[PDB]
Structure formats: structure tokens, C-alpha cells
């Protein structure tokens, strides 16, 4: 069975600095292969990438499934966890999506730009009088958390718990891989269920609310028969998943955009002169360095990709970094050129049913934050020679530190 | 059942000149309704538009299906016609699409730009010395036919039949509603089958060819077991369908782009000054005036759209003009502003499985021809007050004449 080139290692620091650098030789030489250290098939070319991400009937998304402990099944039934937005397919995934996507529409997200700018200025006021700061937790992650809280429309008193909402979730994801012992398992799962019940109560209270918050936007969705389009359990679980899935991705996006603007100062000045380039500064970043460089699916039958035969039930990962940097679709795929004619023509948000629903917000945040970040501290320059601090993760390399000065 | 505002009439001249003008009041007031003069459901909002265009499992494409005459079934079996790319759904549509998409990739389409530019200059040289011309057939339609012949890589000696390929096919489409009488039916269907057999022979001869032309690109697709991925009959039928679906659409795109550049001289000057804007001149045109302003589907079960319940088996049309001009997705939806940040964020090529596969070519053609047209004849001005000549059709309003001067 086909193997992988030597330079292809998603767990190396070379992947943490540039996920697409390890994928060029692989895509060129072995477009579809098998990765044994992860035990999954690997697809790199954009054609096959879009095929796998689109054909849901052939490449299902059932690959992820946490298990609920026994003592919490009275408050959080296992079917609720089985209704995870990442672990469902039509007709259930479409039923959940028709409600989830209703909250990220332009009339709902556009009125958040002034709030994002205001809170970003408030955050910058905390360290604007110094000479340098750790921009990751102090700005990027902080601004993402505040933007998600504004989308949820939650008071600052609930800010701690909301942060915990992501810290718990990742641990839950690791449970199938590094099982938790007691009393860590009970504590983590109880905090998870507590956040779930908090969102449950918020949905029950905002069930007939006609406001901008995603809770009221998803709760007020009633079918022709008056019945709620999504049960309260499903809405609460999807709110938890949205909170946990947006924060790290958007924070990594902002960090990578800061890095790219530091490595390309002329594009930074050009973007400082015209605001309409900021979105492009977004789009070229997430294309060149996607926050989630891997998208997982599972085959429902036997497939043939690039002549390689893949048996039924085989987990297949699409390397979004290889697809976004395919020379067969974009000229100079490794360059950071914000002046491309088709900026949003990438798979950084995948494609099809499981397309990233938080893309309208993230973009706006990326368009709003970076500008403000380069409007308050213009000579912001990423400190060279700072030890790379990355959480060793394959699907989502999270940067823990990024020292910047101005 | 909900009706439509008075101004909504797809068969009126107001729709032929601007398909989005009849859709604004409808989209705002009655987003999903029933049109009795056509007997079909109408969906206008972009939110529901993407769902209907994407959810193939709920909104199938089986609504269109011509019937094969009896005497030609020995040369053109009815199952071959049943394998029409517009009348199939997964798993057959995926099998056909995996082969069709291989011919429109960037490495295949990009080497056609210089040929398109050269042939556009050759065409302009025929009438550049006059003072005015009918730009539709002399340039738009001519350039589209020559571009399709270059994609097929056919000699000019094959120009007549190829032209006939468009004249015949539409009549076949008109058979399901306005049946043909004798002896025209036999002659037209024999010409259709003759073109089908010509493409069959071209596929058999280019079966082992490794060139860029769509015939060799689709014919050389063989699975891991050496067998052809698609039978020769289906490849020939798909070539016929590709020509017939590209010609009129790209010609109407170019005509509408000429009209929009005439109505906005500052954008025309900006595009003349910078080549990178020509593509945007494309994208803003096809957004403001899509060549095919309606996309048809058929429901497989009962659906709920905007609270309106639509029974199973109901033909539903998505008004692409209303979706591309939805104020819920784009600000100032009726203006022709080529300086938008997200130019390709429209449904002019729909979305999902049945997305227009010729979009890479059309764009390339639209950017290449028009530019040359405004590089040879810069002071081109569309003659005001000329009787609008449109073939009275709902799914594809084709303009028959457009007099221009310079
Ligand atoms: C620039 C930042 C972001 C990037 C690069 C990004 C990227 C992605 C990727 C790669 C996926 C996987 C899709 C798949 O597996 O097919 C995804 C899904 C998802 N994203 Fe994001 N995302 C970002 C921001 C956000 C935000 C801000 C939110 C919410 C506020 C969000 C919520 C979600 C959800 C809920 C899913 C699951 C969709 C589903 O499975 O149905 N994302 N995103
Ligand atoms: C800007 C110019 C064009 C426009 C506006 C346009 C419009 C469209 C639209 C809206 C669809 C979607 C039909 C559906 O959803 O079922 C479509 C399908 C299609 N288009 Fe185009 N088109 C254009 C140019 C072309 C070109 C140059 C080709 C060359 C091959 C082409 C070939 C096709 C084919 C074969 C289909 C059927 C796809 C399928 O059903 O699988 N079109 N066209």
C-alpha cells in the first residue's frame, strides 16, 4: 500500500510553522496515500479534496463520537451527544443546519462590527501603554472570546465559564484517546453538562425572543406546525460546539495573519491605506495557513481516488493545507499575495453540508480586529527569536504564545 | 396558495431587460409562492435558494427529460438519453461529474486564453473598419462558438455541424412542450443523433489521447481496472450538452456585460486601465444579470420553506436573480459596483452537485473577449433606443440583437 514522503510529518515543528510545506512533495508524488501513524487515508489534491468534502453520501462524517458517562445520562442523554453537529449526516444534519445557519446571516452578523471594534479598543487599552505584549491570549484569544460572547449576548459575569466551555470540550474530545481517570472524568464531564444546561436554560428563556443573539435566533425557529425546529437539547449542544469550535480557530487565524503581515510589510502598508484589503488579508491568510489543516470523513462504500482503491469504512483525512496550496488551482501557491482575483476560492472552510457556519463572523472579526490592531499600534512588529510554543495537535495546531512589540 | 406581486412576471419585457426588477417586491413580501402561469413553486431568497440548489436528496433534478423517438432507438438508446447530465442524480450524476469536471480544470483551461484572445482579434478585424455592428452574433455568439470549438479542439471545417449542434438541441428541448410535426421531427432528431455519433467517434479516436481538449480529457479517464470510467455514448451526449449549455449562456453573459459597461462608464474606464478588474466586470455582471435566471428542481418529499409547505413531487424554481440581488446578503443589491469585496459570492453558477462546470472557461472567456473588445474599439457605445429582441422563453431569455457603435 502507498506510503508517504519522508518530509510529511504533521506533528513536527516544520508543520507547526507552515502546514503546507510538508504537503507539497506529498501532493505532487503521492496524491492519495495511507498514513499509518494515524491509521487513516490521506487526500491532498484539491479536486479529490472537494470530492471527499462534498460527496457526503460516499464520505460520511460519522468518524467522531464521544461516549457519555453513566452517571450523567439522566441529565445528558447519550442520544444528545449522538446528535453532535460533527457526527451527523442528512437527514439529521440538514435539520440541525437549517436552524444553525440562520444565526450567521449578514443581518445578524454585520451589526456586530461596531461591538467588535469597541471591545477590541477596550482590550487594547489594557496594554497600549506598554512596549510589548503576548498578543495571543491578551488580544487574539481574548477578542475571539469576547466576540463569541457578543454573538451569544452574555454578560461579563458569565465570561469565566464561557472560557471553560472550550477548555472542557477539548478534554472531552481526548477522552476516547487518553481516557480520564477519577475524579478528573466526573469533574470535567459535570462542568460540560453544566454548561450544556446553562445553554439549555438560555434557549428555554429565549424561545420566543426575536433578537440578534444566536440563542434567540435559533430558538425562535418554529416550523409550520408551531413545534420547535430543533429540540432544546440539540440547540444547547450546538451552542456548546459552536463556542468550542470558533474560539481557537479564529484566534489561530488572527495570530497567523499577524505573522504574515509581519513577514510581508508592503502588503501591510497597502492594507493600512485601504480598508477593503483587510478582508483579503484575511482570505490570503486562511488560504496559506488554514487553522484546521485536516478535515476528517469516513467512506460508506469502496472508492477509487487517483487510482488508489480505498475499502469501505475507511477514515479519510483531507489535507486542507495541500488543497489550498495546490499549483493546479492557484499560481504561486506558496506566496502570500493578497491581490488574487479569487480570494475566497479555497477549502479553509471546507465545502458542502459541513461547511463552516461561523465563517461570516470570523471573517468580520478578522476584518475588524486586525485593522484596529494596526490602527492603535501601527508599528506592531512580531518579536523575532521567541521560542515556538505550540500545543502538539494534528487537526488544530494551537499556538500558546506569540510575543509582539511596537 | 400565496401569489406574487403584480410586477412579478417572468414573461414580460421587464423581466427580459432586468430579471431582478420583477423579483424584489416578491422576495421581500412573498419569499416562497406558487406561480400558476407556469404552475411551479417560486423561491427567491438566497437562504432558501442555497438549500434548494444544494439539497439534492430533497430537491432532485429529474424534472427535465426529453423523450426519444421510436425509429432512432437503435442508434441512440433511450437509456443514453436517460443518462443526461441535467436529468441524473447520485450515484449516476456523481459518476458522470467525476469525469466531466476533469476537462475544466485550470491546467486544461488556462492554455486557452491566448487562443481566445487571438481569435477575438481575428473576429474584430472583420468589422473593426465599419461604424457599427450587431455585436451579438458577430462577436459574442461567434466568440463563444469558437471558444467551444477550441476547447473541443476541432478544425474550422467542422464549424457548420457544431453550429447546428446548438440549433438542433434547443428544438429537442422544445419537444416536451411543443411537439414537432412531420417530417421535421425525423430530420431534426436524425441531425441530433448524427452529432451524437460524431462525438462518439471522436471519443473512440481520442480514447487514449493525453491532451488538454475536453474530448481527450474525458475519454482518457479509465479506472484502476483499465475500463473506461464512462461509456462512449454518455461522453458523446455530455459533449453535446456541454456545447449547448455553454454557447447561449456565455453569449448572453458577454452581451449583458457590454450593456453594463455602457451604463457605467467610470467602471468601464477603470477596467480599461487595469486588467485585473475585467474578471470583476464578469463577476458583477453575472451576479446582477445571470444568464440563466431560474434553476429548476423537483421535491422528493414534503418540504417547509419560509413556513410554506410544499408537497412531494412539486416543481420548484429558484430565482437566481432574486438570490444574487438579496439585500440580506449584499448591500445595495441593484447597483453595478465592480469594487465589491466578495465578487464570486453569488449563485449565478448555483451550488452543489449541479454547479456549472464550464465556469472556469466562461470566466476566462468573459475576461479575455470583452477586454479585447474594449482594446480595439475603446469608444464603444450601445445604440440607445433599439427595439429589444428577446426569444420569449422563461428559463433562458436569449437576446437576438444588440447594435453597438464606436
Ligand atoms: C477563521 C476562523 C475559522 C476557521 C479557519 C474555521 C474552519 C473550519 C473547519 C476547517 C471546519 C471543518 C468543516 C468540516 O469538517 O467539513 C469548521 C467547522 C465548523 N466551524 Fe469553523 N472555522 C472558523 C471559525 C469559526 C467560528 C467563529 C465559529 C462559530 C462562532 C465556527 C463554528 C464551526 C462549526 C459549528 C463547525 C461544524 C460544522 C458542521 O460540522 O456542521 N467556526 N470550521
Ligand atoms: C457565465 C456564463 C454561464 C452561466 C451564467 C451559466 C449558468 C448555469 C447555471 C446557473 C447552471 C446550474 C444548473 C442547475 O443548477 O441545474 C448551469 C449548469 C451547467 N452549465 Fe453553465 N453557465 C455559463 C457558462 C457555461 C459554460 C461556458 C459551459 C461549458 C461547458 C457550461 C456548461 C454547463 C453544464 C454542462 C451544466 C450542467 C451541470 C450539471 O447539471 O451537472 N455553462 N449553467
- Please report which helix (H) or strand (E) contains residue B8, including its range: none
Identify how the structure was determined: X-ray
Nearest to A360 by CA among A93, A149, A48, A151: A151
User: What element of type H or E holds B350?
Assistant: none
Half-sphere exposure of B396 (CA within 13 A, CB side): 15
Q: Taking CA atoms, what residue in B is nearest to A364?
A: B341
Q: How many other CB atoms are found less than 10 A from the CB of residue A179?
A: 9
Cell of A213: 443573539
CB atoms B344 and A339 under 8 Å: no
Q: In units of Å, what resolution does this entry have?
A: 3.3
Do the Cβ atoms of B274 and B138 come closer than 8 Å? no
CA dihedral angle for residue A336, residue A342, residue A346, residue A351, rounded to 10 degrees? 170
**CA quadruple B4, B286, B334, A111: dihedral sign:** positive
Contact B75, B186 (CB under 8 A): no
How far apart, in whole angstroms, are the C-alpha atoms of residue A101 and residue A229? Answer: 13
- What is the total count of domains within chain A? 1
Q: Which of A106, A224, A276 sits opposite B329 (nearest CB)?
A: A106
Residue the block writes with cell 472531552: A172
Q: What is the SS3 assignment for A296?
A: strand
**Considering CB atoms only, which of B54, B102, B106 is closest to A329?**
B106
Q: How far is CA B206 from each of CA A362, B109, B203, B242, rounded to the nearest angstrom?
A: 48, 18, 5, 18
Q: Which residues of A102-133 are buried (b: 16+ CB within 10 A; e: fewer)?
A: bbbebebbeebeebbeebbeebbeeeeeeeeb
- How far, in Å, is the centroid of ligand 2 from the Cα of A287? 27
If you measure CA to CA, which chain A residue comes closest to B51?
Answer: A98
For residue A42, list its beta bridge partners.
A33, A317
Helix (H, G, I), strand (E, B) or coil at A297: strand
Residue among B362, B339, B342 at smallest CA distance from B290? B362
Q: Which residue range(s) make up the domain with B292? A: 1-406
Q: How far apart are CA B144 and CA B150, in angstroms?
A: 10
| Residue of the CA atom closest to atom 43 of ligand 1 | A356
Interface of B with A (CB under 8 A): 47, 51, 54-55, 57-58, 90-91, 94, 98, 101-102, 105-107, 223-224, 276, 279-280, 304, 307-309, 328-330, 339, 341-342, 344-345, 352-353
Question: What's the burial of B320, exposed, middle or buried (CB within 10 Å: 0-12/13-18/19+)?
Answer: buried
Nearest CA to B395 among B235, B177, B205, B114? B177
The answer to whether A243 and A306 are in contact (CB under 8 A) is no
Closest CA to A232 of A203, A271, A261: A203
Partners of A98 on chain B (C-beta within 8 Å) are 51
Q: Is B357 in the pocket of ligand 2 (CB under 6 A)?
A: yes
For the CA of A295, the closest atom of ligand 1 is: 15
Query: How many Å apart are CA B213 and CA A338, to the nearest integer?
Result: 32
| Of residues A247, A246, A240, A288, the one with CA closest to residue A264 | A288
Alpha carbon distance A9, A327 (integer Å): 21
Nearest to A55 among B47, B94, B345 (CB): B94
Ligand 1 centroid to Cα of residue B285, in Å, is 31
Whether the CB of B245 sits within 6 Å of ligand 2: yes
Amino acid at each position: 500500500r502507498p506510503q508517504a514522503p519522508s518530509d510529511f510529518n504533521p506533528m513536527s515543528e516544520q508543520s507547526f510553522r507552515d502546514p503546507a510545506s510538508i504537503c507539497q512533495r506529498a501532493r505532487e508524488e503521492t496524491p492519495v496515500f495511507f498514513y499509518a501513524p494515524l491509521g487513516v487515508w490521506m487526500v491532498t489534491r484539491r479536486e479529490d479534496a472537494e470530492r471527499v468534502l462534498s460527496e457526503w453520501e460516499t464520505f460520511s462524517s460519522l468518524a467522531n463520537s464521544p461516549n457519555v458517562p453513566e452517571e450523567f445520562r439522566s441529565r445528558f442523554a447519550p442520544s444528545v451527544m449522538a446528535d453532535s453537529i460533527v457526527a451527523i449526516d442528512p437527514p439529521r444534519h440538514t435539520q440541525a443546519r437549517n436552524v444553525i445557519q440562520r444565526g450567521f446571516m449578514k443581518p445578524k452578523i454585520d451589526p456586530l462590527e461596531p461591538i467588535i471594534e469597541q471591545r477590541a479598543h477596550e482590550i487594547i487599552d489594557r496594554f497600549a501603554g506598554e512596549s510589548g505584549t503576548e498578543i495571543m491570549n491578551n488580544y487574539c484569544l481574548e477578542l475571539t472570546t469576547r466576540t463569541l460572547m457578543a454573538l451569544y449576548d452574555l454578560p461579563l459575569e458569565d465570561r469565566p465559564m464561557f472560557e471553560r466551555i472550550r477548555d472542557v470540550s477539548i478534554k472531552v474530545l481526548a477522552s476516547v484517546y487518553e481516557p480520564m481517570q477519577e475524579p478528573e472524568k466526573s469533574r470535567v464531564w459535570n462542568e460540560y453538562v453544566s454548561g450544556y444546561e446553562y445553554f439549555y436554560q438560555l434557549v428555554e428563556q429565549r424561545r420566543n425572543s426575536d433578537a440578534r443573539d444566536i440563542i434567540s435566533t435559533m430558538a425562535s425557529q418554529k416550523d409550520n406546525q408551531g413545534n420547535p425546529a430543533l429540540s432544546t437539547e440539540r440547540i444547547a449542544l450546538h451552542l456548546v460546539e459552536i463556542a468550542f469550535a470558533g474560539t481557537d480557530t479564529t484566534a489561530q487565524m488572527m495570530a497567523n495573519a499577524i505573522l504574515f503581515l509581519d513577514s510581508h510589510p508592503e502588503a501591510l502598508a497597502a492594507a493600512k491605506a485601504d480598508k477593503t484589503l483587510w478582508s483579503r488579508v484575511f482570505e490570503e491568510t486562511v488560504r496559506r495557513r488554514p487553522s484546521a489543516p485536516f478535515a476528517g470523513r469516513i467512506t460508506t462504500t469502496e472508492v477509487e481516488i487517483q487510482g488508489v482503491k480505498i475499502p469501505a469504512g475507511s477514515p479519510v483525512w483531507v489535507s486542507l493545507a495541500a488543497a489550498n496550496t495546490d499549483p493546479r488551482h492557484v499560481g504561486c501557491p506558496m506566496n502570500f499575495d493578497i491581490n488574487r482575483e479569487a480570494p475566497q476560492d479555497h477549502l479553509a472552510f471546507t465545502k458542502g453540508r459541513h461547511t463552516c457556519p461561523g465563517a461570516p463572523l470570523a471573517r468580520l472579526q478578522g476584518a475588524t480586529g486586525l485593522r484596529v490592531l494596526f490602527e492603535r499600534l501601527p508599528e506592531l512588529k512580531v518579536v523575532p527569536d521567541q521560542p515556538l510554543n505550540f500545543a502538539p495537535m494534528a487537526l488544530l495546531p494551537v499556538r500558546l504564545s506569540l510575543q509582539v512589540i511596537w
